[PDB]
Design a protein around this ligand. Sequence first.
Ligand code: TYR
Ligand code: TYR
Lengths: 526, 526
Amino acid sequence: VPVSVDGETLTVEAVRRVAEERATVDVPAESIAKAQKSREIFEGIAEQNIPIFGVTTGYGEMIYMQVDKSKEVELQTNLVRSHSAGVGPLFAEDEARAIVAARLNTLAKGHSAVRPIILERLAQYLNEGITPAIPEIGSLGDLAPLSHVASTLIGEGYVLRDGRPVETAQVLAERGIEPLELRFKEGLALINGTSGMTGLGSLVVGRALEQAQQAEIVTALLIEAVRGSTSPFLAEGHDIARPHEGQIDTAANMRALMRGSGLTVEHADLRRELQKDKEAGKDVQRSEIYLQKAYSLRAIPQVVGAVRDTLYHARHKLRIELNSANDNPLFFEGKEIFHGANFHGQPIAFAMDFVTIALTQLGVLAERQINRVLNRHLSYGLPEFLVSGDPGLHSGFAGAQYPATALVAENRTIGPASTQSVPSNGDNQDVVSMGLISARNARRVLSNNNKILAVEYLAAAQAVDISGRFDGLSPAAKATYEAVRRLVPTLGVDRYMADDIELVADALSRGEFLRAIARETDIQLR
Amino acid sequence: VPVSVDGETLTVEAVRRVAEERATVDVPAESIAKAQKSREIFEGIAEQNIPIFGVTTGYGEMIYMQVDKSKEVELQTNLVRSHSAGVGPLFAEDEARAIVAARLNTLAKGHSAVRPIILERLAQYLNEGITPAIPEIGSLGDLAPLSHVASTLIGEGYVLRDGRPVETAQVLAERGIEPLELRFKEGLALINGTSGMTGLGSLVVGRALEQAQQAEIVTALLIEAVRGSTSPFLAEGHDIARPHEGQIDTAANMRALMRGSGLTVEHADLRRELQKDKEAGKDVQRSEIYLQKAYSLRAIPQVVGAVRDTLYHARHKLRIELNSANDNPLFFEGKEIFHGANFHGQPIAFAMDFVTIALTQLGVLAERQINRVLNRHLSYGLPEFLVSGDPGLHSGFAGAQYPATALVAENRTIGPASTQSVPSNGDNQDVVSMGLISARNARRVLSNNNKILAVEYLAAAQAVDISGRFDGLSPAAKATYEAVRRLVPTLGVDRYMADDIELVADALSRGEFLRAIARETDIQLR
Ligand SMILES: N[C@@H](Cc1ccc(O)cc1)C(=O)O
Ligand SMILES: N[C@@H](Cc1ccc(O)cc1)C(=O)O
């Protein structure tokens, strides 16, 4: 299962494989050769003492400082050090690995003028399990975080071991590795890109998509458990009447998940049951039958679909970015040293701010579906707060609804960061993107959404037990139901709810509910 | 010249033509035909008194109330009236027209089961200048605003005339038009869609792109005025190293705008001019010749490019939406009436929130470029605050910078609305999109951006006079320069600036600088 880091075809899912599943990485000889190439282009110029940014000059506003080739190695060392000023908590192992891979892929595109050893060493770290200790704060959108990574290649800084930072010097001398010594433009190239936000963003987006699927999965279970109509998901509504890709995809997944359900109702059945319930003698009469259900159980295609569209767009931008030469300056055949701003992370800063927004609404919808099932006037029949015990004496899921509701409110306090640029570096960086903050914002909402969904999964499984509708559940709903009971038992009388919720929340973050559908059925969700 | 409203091929630009230039609309015969057949079939179903949401039942939560068909017109009429509860300011003529246009296109798709007369009357209103008085507030994402529109079709509510509301019944008596009477499902179809946010959103996104163009136009002029480098715009840095579509477009537009400039330099002229400055003596030598770097002028493709991507995504969403049957329930030949939620404006709510964020950043960049030219420390040699006389005694543009700086901060206080749902209607509408609020937010930042750009167009022209570089400008830079000076004179002595700024802001809102590039050069911008 090797992953080709060529600076051209790396996908978001592949980055997750490398970061999450320790997937082996391989930098193609073509990438290596193309890499050495640009290296000679550069050196063929660096030979002379001619001016070039970040290699024969100062850094930032100090580009006005001309520097000779004498202390080539020191210039790189001074940069990586002075810029390793990151603060806050350290990124997690998988997060740090995703960042490292994005940077490797970037250098592997071939226009950074870096020695092949840089790519080879980076590739060794991932493959050898040596993860840099990357503090989360510092990037203006990603100098500081990438600087901490840079430090570990030169045997400095810290590496992540069992959740704690351990000096890189020891770890290397340990597994017998001579720390690299950075040459011209290697220090700058290592840190002058969007690898922080792009690496983290990839994990988040990939996971956001699974969350969309897992929202659809429990949403489907809930719809069955309450015998909702299937009309809202009919293809004519989306494939033909309002063709947004996301909407079509969710409507599709919903039909597959509820297919073969004995509990769901066809519109025609409602229309006919409702009709018989009417007295042809009077113009206006009351009925207890709802031809339609509330928005939270009817508008799933529109809302989750819009979220999907947002995630598709974000994945699209990341795929391009991962495979871009987000670095400066750059080198091309018979070309002058390209001086631009491909280090600017606006594209990804925007994409992630949009992910934050989309996932917030995904959570808003899940929480209202929980409110749906817990409220007796809205549940369509189930007992208040899903009590099995004498009600009042027992509260059921009443208290468990609070953290879900609370999280919706907390996610709404998270504002966009891609527009919060603040000028620094003597007005040199007068417009930045703060994209890493955007990525972290989306990560937070994603994380909070698993807790919201956790309560929804527990609630949906409980509604099944109380209604005694298990034998009517569809193949998918049975799988979902069983995956939940496997982790948490039915709620007879009241009990400490926290562990159960965190138990189902962690399962969701590991994609165990998407897994269950995969194993127990042949449905291949979009 | 007639825009074809067929519910299948309408474009955002087409919508703007109808709304802004009063282009004539035409519902093609095939559309009428489809509407005609779909109606007769629907009427047969209705005439049977079988349950059909909003046609033989109550609205929203009161769908449990069954209504006999003997109350056909009353049911629909009561809906339109009781839902005409909009508040706040009225939309402008062009905004009201875009909304009406989007509604007409929705119904014309042929799945709303409305009588052709409805499509005809709508078009007649557009083609004859009968503009509904539509209050901006009330939509949960667009019942209220659309009900006000619906009210005018039955000769109620108000029509917009000279910025003020005039009772509809009257205007129709003057124009000699007999009000319509609403039949089965016609009241619901007129209001149960996303036409509010989709009509406004179209105008905004259309203008947003023009705003990105004018941002690129003034940036090009400014870069020429200060003799900046053209290297960051080289095709290889985008087309090949970083292929985000928007970024490629901006770089290309910038190259075309500065083509033929005698004031711009290349990275080569700096490294070469730098070699001179440097000497074989010293090892760290300071120069005053910055390898060019202020991001404000180096990152243009990256930042404005990302803005473009956001705008492209939104335009696509709007194109799909304009041609959708965003209404409920829906009729499909030989099938059960579709009862879903295609009225839900989430896709557009998300789209416009993103546009809001994107445009906010566009303004952030412009404001910093203004700061760039007004700060002597960064002016590239220009006098402080572009004073052409005695600084201190005169402040020049020092005061004009404030409205621009203040607007950036003001735009930053505008939060996303697509996530602010609040359950209403007895919890039936437990999750909404708040999309029209999103569209308005976007329109606001758009409007605010014209003011910031206005200050930047003035400072740039001023920079050109003070440095006497008018002769070295490119053909586009001259067109831009003359366009500004045709409106506002050079700033000799300090003077009241408020009028000069508003005049240029207004010119920008009409696309004047984009037009100047059209009739003065052979440049076609993306
Ligand atoms: N990203 C900067 C390089 C840089 C280096 C050091 C800094 O402190 C800041 C910026 C550029 O390419 O212009
Ligand atoms: N959008 C509603 C229609 C509606 C909603 C609320 C009302 O108050 C009236 C009508 C639906 O299609 O289900």
